[PDB]
Amino acid sequence: QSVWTQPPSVSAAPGQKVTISCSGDDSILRSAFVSWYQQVPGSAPKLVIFDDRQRPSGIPARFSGSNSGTTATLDIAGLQRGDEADYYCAAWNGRLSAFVFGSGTKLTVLGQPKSSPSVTLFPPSSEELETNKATLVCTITDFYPGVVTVDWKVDGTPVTQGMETTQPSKQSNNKYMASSYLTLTARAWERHSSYSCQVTHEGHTVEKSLSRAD
Amino acid sequence: QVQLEESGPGLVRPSETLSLSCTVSGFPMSESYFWGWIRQSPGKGLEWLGSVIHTGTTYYRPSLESRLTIAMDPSKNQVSLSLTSVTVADSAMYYCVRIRGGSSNWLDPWGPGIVVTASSAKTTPPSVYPLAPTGSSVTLGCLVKGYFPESVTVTWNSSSVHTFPALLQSGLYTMSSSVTVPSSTWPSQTVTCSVAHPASSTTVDKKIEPR
């Protein structure tokens, strides 16, 4: 594939152990040396594992790696506050003949109870409708950990364009917020009748919908 | 210590060519290491663009190979990138990296990175559209659409405020603000966002109305 598959979120308390996994088609990873990179907000990626399981100078032995070939893994034990970051796997893909990264995993080192998002779904203003543009706004607040997946449906159909979602941002209370935007033409707003914003957080989805005639 | 620094334009017009370069310090490029470019689009993942070694051997991202040129000047401690016909989708953080090649293919170290924004827009103040809705408290908002460049501040006169970060959409920024208040307070006591955009030196207000 063009992008290795990692889980979006993994989390655990300080002192505990987590596994971040990385995979491609069949057993493609067996043919390559996997590397892993840590990225904290504001910084560039830092190398933390290379050649499947080697640690560079400065990396503690509680970080470890492996490449079973189907699935590569980054295993971090004795979790500390400073391990909370995005982690990306990477490896050469000789079928594409390119260097491929994984989709990233946020490792949340748990510092509070888990919290489900509060979703609000706003309709487009009539002011905006005079531009022949309609924007529906889905606000998502008070969630922890700070990883959501946002999916939209128009008349039960998954929306494949005209939708974009902000990266999650830290609130003042230290939970996370984000917003999502479905932009249509004003003609489309009149045509369709049902809209849903679906926010999935830790496997459970919270949904708000809005019908045109209301 | 081994240090990499990226330079180039922070703002380029679509259809123009993006020219970046990278300066290496404390390490010669005549060693058997590749020098390459990675990009990271905001709120998204990492994308290898390509790399080159002092012998002249070069590898590119296949999606972008026809538009990409990556070259190296070892005497000047420089690697470079040229990407023709820049698109809005090419807005990203751009990182320079040292790559151990062969079968290892590890990246260390990484430049701090350079933000590149692709937009044809002039300095543009935001249009400000109200967000408005059977419950004991109520949430309103202020949709702040189609401005350039960042930033805007939103301030309410009504209470818990949520200022959402901005999204680059097709060359123009979009952000939201929300405020939540008791249902007896609104519509009774009215509520107003004030949106400031320093780069356009404007300030727009919007009272939020019931539907």
């Binding site: 050469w92 | 058997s32 070694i53 790559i99 062969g102």
Partner: peptide, 9 residues
């Protein structure tokens, strides 16, 4: 070959 980029041997 450290002069190339590729898969394991």
């Amino acid at each position: 070959e450290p002069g190339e980029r590729g898969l394991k041997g």
